[model samples]
Target chain A: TTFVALYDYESRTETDLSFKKGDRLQIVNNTEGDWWLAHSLTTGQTGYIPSNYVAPS
Target chain B: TTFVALYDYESRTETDLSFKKGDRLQIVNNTEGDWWLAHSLTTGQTGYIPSNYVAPS
Candidate 1:
């Protein structure tokens, strides 16, 4: 069993921190997720979270 | 003007964690990375680290 991933299932989403909420899920397979990885897409701006925090449903 | 992201900025890394550490990053733009984003790559096993924890140098 598996479900969709979210940034912080409890803290906040990327910039859309106003909509996403944190939670837990049951895994059915070997999944990988980053917890607080960040990548610079531009400057003076940043978005972060664990990988797989959201699965492309 | 950019840096790689890590899980938790003070937490765990992927399965190859035998040689990884967490730290703060200075993001550059809007690049998006998955945090806690679990993807079932196998079964009964898991390896996760916030996406972008390592930039393809």
Candidate 2:
């Protein structure tokens, strides 16, 4: 159930947020659009994007 | 269960990808160790690492 890749407009970059990808990311609370997916590894970030980013992954 | 943090070793950078963060993202399939998130924006990417890159906002 973890598909559809996307981007993060808040952080102004691309990102991945799903256990399917094996990542351990946690959604922050600075935004509210069912988007914003913060990484739990690096200090970087992203926001607002499409769902095709990880759709085929 | 999106509270853990992690890193993308392949991309060699950081990323913010979650609904809480108010962004968009998806999980990519690569190595197969349950780690590695690929973004669909900015033409960027990331890989395996830890589970704290996006833990606590």
Candidate 3:
């Protein structure tokens, strides 16, 4: 399934994920947290993204 | 299963994972690539790591 980013984000920390508004992500680990691990379907990149930045697709 | 990191890897990129020698990781995505997605058993951190940095347990 896909998730959509709600806003633009640029990684501040190395482990952090970057995404643009409307970017599509593959939910790899949807576990609860302020952050969730996800994969960029477009870029093939995986990292921790802010949970508030995306919603279920 | 558990896996061990063969060498220290500091995250240099946003999507990159960081770990030290002897770190244990849970195999989440072992697909072929220069990098693979894994979760640190100790910290619960997940990200992309060098394929050469880990071995199956």
Best by DockQ: 1
**TM-scores of chain B, in order:** 0.22, 0.24, 0.47
Candidate achieving higher lDDT, 1 or 2 = 1
Better of 1 and 2 by DockQ: 1
Model 2 over residues A1-57: C-alpha lDDT tens digits? 222322222232333332332232432222222322323322334432223223221
Better of 2 and 3 by DockQ: 2
| Candidate 2 error regions (>4 Å) | A1-57, B1-20, B36-57
lDDT of 2: 0.30
Order by TM-score, highest first: 3, 1, 2
What is residue A37's positional error in candidate 3, in angstroms?
A: 14
What ranges in model 1 sit over 4 Å off? A4-34, A39-57, B1-24, B28-32, B37-42, B49-57
**lDDT (0 to 1) per candidate:** 0.32, 0.30, 0.43
TM-score of chain A of 3: 0.48
Backbone collisions counted per model: 35, 41, 0
Cα interface RMSD of each candidate: 14.0, 16.3, 17.3
- What is candidate 1's lDDT per residue for B8-36, written digit by digit as tens? 33223231111112323442233444433
Q: For model 3 chain A, give the 10-residue run with minimal summed lDDT.
A: A27-36
The 10-residue segment with the lowest total lDDT in model 1 chain A:
A12-21
Q: Mind giving the per-residue lDDT tens digits that candidate 1 earns over A15-43? A: 22211223223322334343333443323
